[PDB]
């Protein structure tokens, strides 16, 4: 059986969540996609889903993927963004889900988008465990003093409501999929400006894994048939 790392998510469980009363039993969009894709392969793939994370906060997804390079995981299934530092250590599938960063802010915010958020003095929120932190630092040179990690949609909402004046944020940078789920439950907030990154979600396997190439064909089969959108819509639908 393959040891498949799964992120032990504390928020936005629609993507992946551990089943109550179990360590190794998971449900969600990412798990349905995987299950769908494996069923199109010419060979059996017996798995053990191993939770990665402390159960209190969403894990570092980069660190989850690194456990492939150490041989602790045979691969990783979840909402894993196919970003460059990750692609240098493991082999991702074709993307099964479109993603990328947006700016989330209050209705009347003076922020026009990422460029305006940039030159500001104020805190920016990001999601616990996300690449979004290194992107803000490496790509936009935002001071670490300004970057606030936020673990839950409830923490997102409190931080935006409070604002910089009360130990909150002026805005949150997070990938569109989580943000759509957030705004669905928190209709006071908006995306400001354009999606300014475009990395999708992939399944991660060891470099030169045949399973990453076989699963890519299977994912292209799900997308071409409309099933990928069907799976997306059954888990994700102001
Ligand atoms: N999809 C995010 C992880 C989200 C989270 O922080 O839980 C990533 O690939 O980095
Ligand atoms: Na499921
Ligand atoms: Na094989």
UniProtKB/Swiss-Prot annotation:
Cysteines paired by S-S bonds: 187-238
Cellular component terms per the entry's GO annotation: plasma membrane
Main localization category: membrane
Subcellular location as annotated: Cell membrane
Binding-site residues, L-methionine: 79-81, 86, 131, 175-178
Keywords for the protein's UniProt record, in alphabetical order: Cell membrane, Disulfide bond, Glycoprotein, Ion channel, Ion transport, Ligand-gated ion channel, Membrane, Receptor, Signal, Transmembrane, Transmembrane helix, Transport
Origin: domain of life: Eukaryota
Disruption phenotype: Impaired glutamate-triggered (and Ala, Asn, Cys, Gly, Ser and glutathione-triggered) membrane depolarization and calcium rise. Reduced wound-activated surface potential changes (WASP) duration in the wounded leaf, resulting in a decreased induction of the regulators of jasmonate-signaling in the systemic leaves. Glr3.3 and glr3.6 double mutant has no detectable changes in surface potential in systemic leaves and the induction of the regulators of jasmonate-signaling is more strongly decreased.
Tissue specificity remark: Expressed predominantly in roots and siliques.
Binding-site positions, L-glutamate: 9, 79-81, 86, 131, 175-178
GO MF assignments: calcium channel activity; glutamate receptor activity; ligand-gated monoatomic ion channel activity
Sugar attachment sites: 85, 141
Extracellular side: 110-238
GO BP terms: calcium ion transport; calcium-mediated signaling; cell-cell signaling; cellular response to amino acid stimulus; defense response to fungus; gravitropism; induced systemic resistance, jasmonic acid mediated signaling pathway; innate immune response
Residues reported in the UniProt entry to bind L-cysteine: 79-81, 86, 131, 175-178
Annotated positions binding glycine: 79-81, 86, 131, 175-178
Self-association and partners: May form heteromers.
Function: Glutamate-gated receptor that probably acts as a non-selective cation channel, at least in roots and hypocotyls. Can be triggered by Ala, Asn, Cys, Glu, Gly, Ser and glutathione (a tripeptide consisting of Glu-Gly-Cys). Mediates leaf-to-leaf wound signaling. May be involved in light-signal transduction and calcium homeostasis via the regulation of calcium influx into cells. Contributes to pathogen-associated molecular patterns (PAMP) elicitor-mediated resistance.
Family: Belongs to the glutamate-gated ion channel (TC 1.A.10.1) family.
Listed name of the protein: Glutamate receptor 3.3
Recorded name of the encoding gene: GLR3.3
């Amino acid at each position: 059986e393959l040891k498949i790392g799964v992120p032990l998510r504390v928020s936005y469980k629609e993507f992946v969540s551990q089943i109550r009363g179990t360590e190794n039993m998971f449900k969600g969009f990412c798990i349905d996609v995987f299950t769908a894709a494996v069923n199109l392969l010419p060979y059996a793939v017996p798995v053990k889903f191993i939770p990665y994370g402390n159960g209190k906060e969403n894990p570092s997804y980069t660190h989850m993927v690194e456990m492939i390079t150490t041989g602790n995981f045979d691969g990783v299934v979840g909402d894993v963004a196919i970003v460059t530092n990750r692609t240098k250590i493991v082999d991702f599938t074709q993307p099964y889900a479109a993603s990328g960063l947006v700016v989330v802010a209050p209705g009347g915010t003076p922020i026009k988008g990422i460029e305006s958020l940039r030159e500001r003095d104020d805190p920016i929120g990001y999601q616990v465990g996300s690449f979004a932190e290194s992107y803000l630092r490496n790509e936009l040179n935002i001071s670490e003093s300004r970057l606030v990690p936020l673990g839950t949609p409830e923490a997102y909402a409190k931080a935006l409501k409070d604002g910089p004046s009360k130990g909150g944020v002026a805005a949150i940078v997070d990938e569109r999929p989580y943000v759509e789920l957030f705004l669905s439950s928190n209709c006071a907030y908006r995306i400001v400006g354009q999606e300014f990154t475009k990395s999708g979600w992939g399944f991660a396997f060891p470099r030169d894994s045949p399973l990453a190439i076989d699963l890519s064909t299977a994912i292209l089969e799900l997308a071409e048939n409309g099933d990928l959108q069907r799976i997306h819509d059954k888990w994700l639908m102001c």
